[PDB]
Amino acid sequence: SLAEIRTDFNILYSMMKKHEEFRWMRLRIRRMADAWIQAIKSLAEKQNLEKRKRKKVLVHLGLLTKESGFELVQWSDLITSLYLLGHDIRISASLAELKEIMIVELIYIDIVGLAQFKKTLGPSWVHYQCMLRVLDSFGTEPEFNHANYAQSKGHKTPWGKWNLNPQQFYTMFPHTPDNSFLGFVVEQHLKRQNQSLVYGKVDSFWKNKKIYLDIIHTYMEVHATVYTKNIPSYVKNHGILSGRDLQFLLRETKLFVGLGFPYEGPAPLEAIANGCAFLNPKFNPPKSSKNTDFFIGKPTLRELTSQHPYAEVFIGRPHVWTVDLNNQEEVEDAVKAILNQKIEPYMPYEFTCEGMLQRINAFIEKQDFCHGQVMWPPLSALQVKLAEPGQSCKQVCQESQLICEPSFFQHLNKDKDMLKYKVTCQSSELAKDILVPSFDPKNKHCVFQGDLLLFSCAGAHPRHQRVCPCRDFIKGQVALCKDCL
Ligand SMILES: CC(=O)N[C@H]1[C@H](O[C@@H]2[C@@H](OC[C@H]3O[C@@H](O)[C@@H](O)[C@@H](O)[C@@H]3O)O[C@H](CS)[C@@H](O)[C@@H]2O)O[C@H](CO)[C@@H](O)[C@@H]1O
């Protein structure tokens, strides 16, 4: 009944072949087989992976059911990680298989599949909800997760209102510390020219970018991989390329040119992994559900400061140049600096096979939401910081090379507890608000949280200071504190 790491993928191929939609993921795993097997072996050498309980795991892809009416790289890398860790995976892609499978101990599912889960099981779905790990690309902030609080704000979300522990939501990039960062692996299939490659397979992505692209064209060739109105005539199109052929072109390319869309994708990381610089359009104002139709109705008010905020903040220069495209002299300076500077290929640790294996194994072994409030990460990692007015708990932790840990909020929510962190409450009141525990420096006063489901890393107090729980993290592995293994 103990998990045994796997080093042969034959059983995984037979599992994935039962679903036609995984055809190209089976091809991707076969390419990445050696990288996966070397990573699981390396993880078993660096950490004690013995005596782990074998878990029966449901993986329900709601987006693949025909009832949804409706991405897959994350699912495959999650399934592969579970498989290599030795767990018992039951893949579901319809209401029928979901009914049959529903002895289960972990449920990976998307929000669309979650509504199918609630309907298939009826009221006893809440009996299982602490086992849910909800793949939610753009993240869910507590303001939208708390159904009654969402109504009080007027939030119209088809995606929120689920009243889960917000750490049960698993995001595509570490942009929402209220959630868990699941991510994926950037596949690496493997002389550089004065040429750029535009990020964008759709011609409509190129509208209005002529002035922008003309600046780059002054210094480099402009290449593309497009399916042609908005494409300048000087663009050297390559057509659609296999992933392997795309990476050879990336090794030939100095600059990967972002157009502003799509947001938060894997392609910039794959460019950087092959020695490309990424020109990352900066957004003023930042784009969110409040001002961008692409984000309308998302269960979050997160603001994207650029096309790829992860690349902007967690990678940065010299690999990522975040520039407002209207600042033509700044764009000229960036393209020119990238022209002579030699950058070496860079891949963040958390987006490698071993990084994800370590991350997902820690989540499986340490994340427990079935006994009320949480005890992992350990309290030892708690580093308290006070955010300034207009600053969120996410920001005050990030600026100090830490990250907000929502499970620590419970330890900063009363008078006596605040003494340990050098904040003296002459007087205290309680509020049900995502912005508390708030501190009042100009006047003694503390406001504590009256609804524990409203603990929120996101959100900035407009007048007061926020008491913010931060934690360290293993370098290149934002999801794990140093003592979290
Ligand atoms: C795969 C993925 O990223 N899913 C996230 C989802 O992303 C949106 C989703 O929209 C699908 C479908 O949704 C219906 O409600 C209608 O609005 C349809 O018009 C729409 O096509 O998937 C597409 C990619 S196919 C993506 O572009 C959408 O943004 O968003 C939710 C909420 O943030 C997230 O939880 C899912 O993980």
Author numbering: 214 to 283, 297 to 328, 345 to 432, 444 to 480, 484 to 741
Provide passages from the article that reported this PDB entry:
Consequently, we designed a new truncated construct of GnT-V luminal domain, mini-GnT-V, in which N-terminal domain (T121-N212) was deleted. Also, the long unstructured loop (K330-R344), involved in an interregional disulfide bond (C172-C338), was replaced with a short linker of four glycine residues to reduce the structural heterogeneity. We further introduced the inactive E297A mutation to mini-GnT-V to form a stable complex with ligand. Crystal structure of mini-GnT-V E297A mutant in complex with the ligand was successfully determined at 2.1 Å resolution. The asymmetric unit contains two mini-GnT-V inhibitor complexes, referred to as complex A and B. Structural superposition of the two complexes demonstrated that overall RMSD value of Cα atoms is only 0.76 Å. Of note, one difference is that the weak electron density of a highly mobile region (G282-G296) is observed in complex B and included in the final model. The trisaccharide moiety binds to mini-GnT-V between the two middle domains. Among the three sugar residues, both GlcNAc-3 and Man-2 are buried in the cavity and tightly bind to mini-GnT-V via direct and water-mediated interactions, whereas Man-1 is exposed to solvent. Notably, two aromatic rings of F380 and W401 contact the trisaccharide and the side chain of W401 and seem to restrain the conformation of the α1-6 branch. We applied the bisubstrate inhibitor for co-crystallization, but the electron density of the donor moiety was completely missing.
Human GnT-V is a type II membrane protein and comprises 741 amino acids in total. GnT-V acts only on the α1-6 mannose branch of N-glycans, and this process is highly regulated. Mechanistically, the β1-6 branch glycan modification by GnT-V allows target proteins to be decorated with a number of N-acetyllactosamine (LacNAc) residues, creating high-affinity ligands for galectins. In this study, we determined the crystal structures of the GnT-V catalytic domain in an apo form and in complex with our bisubstrate-type inhibitor as a substrate analog.
